[PDB]
Design a protein around this ligand. Structure first.
Ligand SMILES: OC[C@H]1O[C@H](O[C@H]2[C@H](O)[C@@H](O)[C@@H](O)O[C@@H]2CO)[C@H](O)[C@@H](O)[C@@H]1O
Ligand SMILES: N[C@@H](CCC(=O)N[C@@H](CS)C(=O)NCC(=O)O)C(=O)O
Lengths: 433, 5
């Protein structure tokens, strides 16, 4: 259970959580309600594990891509903004928070990666990925390196993998097809091979993570990095003379970065949905609210039309929207967490030389497709299990699930998740239909 | 997530 008359917010560690807490202080000064902001590790995975048992934050912040899975699991309260509030945010930002025709979260800002470069080490940054090896050889001579970015998260290496034809799923006829997956194609292979070749040629180390790349660029050791708006405030602190520009092209095609919409969703198990709505609509989604988060770690291109009119003057936001128009919006389908686990595995294995590009991507394509196919089976099984009212079959199912041990009894319900059950136990449930 | 009365 979640405490009443108190709001608890969860947001990622790379976002402006101290600035968000400053907005919670204004909320407390005007209403009396205490607001507590937390930034757990792996919060995208913690939220489904705690919100199922009625615990967790009242508000959760993440990009839109994970919200579809939370909505299908019944974890999110359906937000109902009045017509006049909806006109304050850009229409395409509300589309990213729409699942099954319902609005499941409040859009906050649009993010996309950009090429961030150091003007004192490299005033003319490369326009192509292919000229980075020669540039690195020229920079190493001067005691520096060309490029360093997070190689541990597929979000960062995706601009290059999608450049020549890679894609998450086909969005054929206004609906994503979980069968058509563009990870094994020749465009994705061409992209990831280029990346692996940079590492084999010592132009990059496969062990580079977020922190290593952040410190090397901010200390002046590397000429370029690939990061989002949230990173700008730390670069300012380092006093590095930096620019934010277009991501380089690969095989004449532009790098296609994933575009995410930072969203705030209200937990369905929370008794503070009234306070959460008041906080998000009248405190956070205002020029003053967004400015407090943006001053901590930049949001990018905010969803609020009035505050975006001020930020549009910023050439770093122009670079962000330039890269965002060239990339792809993140799909919001519930098997996106399985898609991400697959691409993350293939990228790391190929980068480290543990698998070839063709082998790594074939396994990713195979797993993403299989995990999505099985999840749709579970969604059809769930729809039929809720239409079931025959107390006889319900008792037989309650008994089969009792044998497995995969269940929990609450004051009013007998709970169990179809995802937690063995693929064998699911086949038994089909026989009951 | 399945819940049963
Ligand atoms: O790498 C997979 C990861 O990609 C995206 O996460 C981004 C996020 O959108 C950004 O705001 C920032 O925090 O960097 C993350 C990558 O480190 C997806 O949103 C996420 O679901 C996925 O796991
Ligand atoms: N990317 C948006 C559509 C594009 C949009 O809303 N604005 C700009 C993004 S650069 C655009 O391309 N506008 C096209 C036009 O004004 O004809 C979506 O698919 O939801």
């Amino acid at each position: 259970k979640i405490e009443e008359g108190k709001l608890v917010i969860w947001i990622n560690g790379d976002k402006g959580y101290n600035g968000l807490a400053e907005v919670g202080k204004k909320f407390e000064k005007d209403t009396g309600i205490k607001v507590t902001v937390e930034h757990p590790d792996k919060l995208e995975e913690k939220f489904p594990q705690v919100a199922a048992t009625g615990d967790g934050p009242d508000i959760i912040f993440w990009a839109h891509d994970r919200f579809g899975g939370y909505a299908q699991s019944g974890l999110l309260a359906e937000i109902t903004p009045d017509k006049a509030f909806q006109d304050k945010l850009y229409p395409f930002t509300w589309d990213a928070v729409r699942y099954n025709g319902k609005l499941i979260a409040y859009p906050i800002a649009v993010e996309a990666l950009s090429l961030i470069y150091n003007k004192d080490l490299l005033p003319n940054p490369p326009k192509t990925w292919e000229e980075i090896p020669a540039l690195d050889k020229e920079l190493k001579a001067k005691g520096k390196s060309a490029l360093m970015f997070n190689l541990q998260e597929p979000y960062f290496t995706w601009p290059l993998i999608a450049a020549d034809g890679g894609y998450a799923f086909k969005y054929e006829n206004g609906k994503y097809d979980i069968k058509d997956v563009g990870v094994d194609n020749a465009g994705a292979k061409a992209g990831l091979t280029f990346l692996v070749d940079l590492i084999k040629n010592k132009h990059m180390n496969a062990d580079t993570d977020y922190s290593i790349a952040e410190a090397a660029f901010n200390k002046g050791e590397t000429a370029m990095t690939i990061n989002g708006p949230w990173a700008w405030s730390n670069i300012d602190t380092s006093k590095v003379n930096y620019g934010v520009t277009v991501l380089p092209t690969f095989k004449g095609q532009p790098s296609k970065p994933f575009v995410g919409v930072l969203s705030a969703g209200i937990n369905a198990a929370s008794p503070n949905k009234e306070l959460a709505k008041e906080f998000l609509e009248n405190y956070l989604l205002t020029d003053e609210g967004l400015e407090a988060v943006n001053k901590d770690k930049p949001l990018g291109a905010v969803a609020l039309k009035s505050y975006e009119e001020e930020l549009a003057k910023d050439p770093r936001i122009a670079a962000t929207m330039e890269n965002a128009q060239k990339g792809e919006i993140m799909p919001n389908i519930p098997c996106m967490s399985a898609f991400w686990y697959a691409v993350r595995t293939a990228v790391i294995n190929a980068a480290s030389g543990r698998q070839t590009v063709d082998e790594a991507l074939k396994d990713a394509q195979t797993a993403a497709a299989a995990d999505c196919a099985y999840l749709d089976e579970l969604v059809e099984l769930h729809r039929r299990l809720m239409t079931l009212r025959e107390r006889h079959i319900l008792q037989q199912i309650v008994n089969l699930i009792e044998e497995t041990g995969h269940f929990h009894i609450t004051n009013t319900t007998f709970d169990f998740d179809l995802c937690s059950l063995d693929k064998t136990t699911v086949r038994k449930l089909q026989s009951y239909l | 997530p399945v819940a049963a009365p």
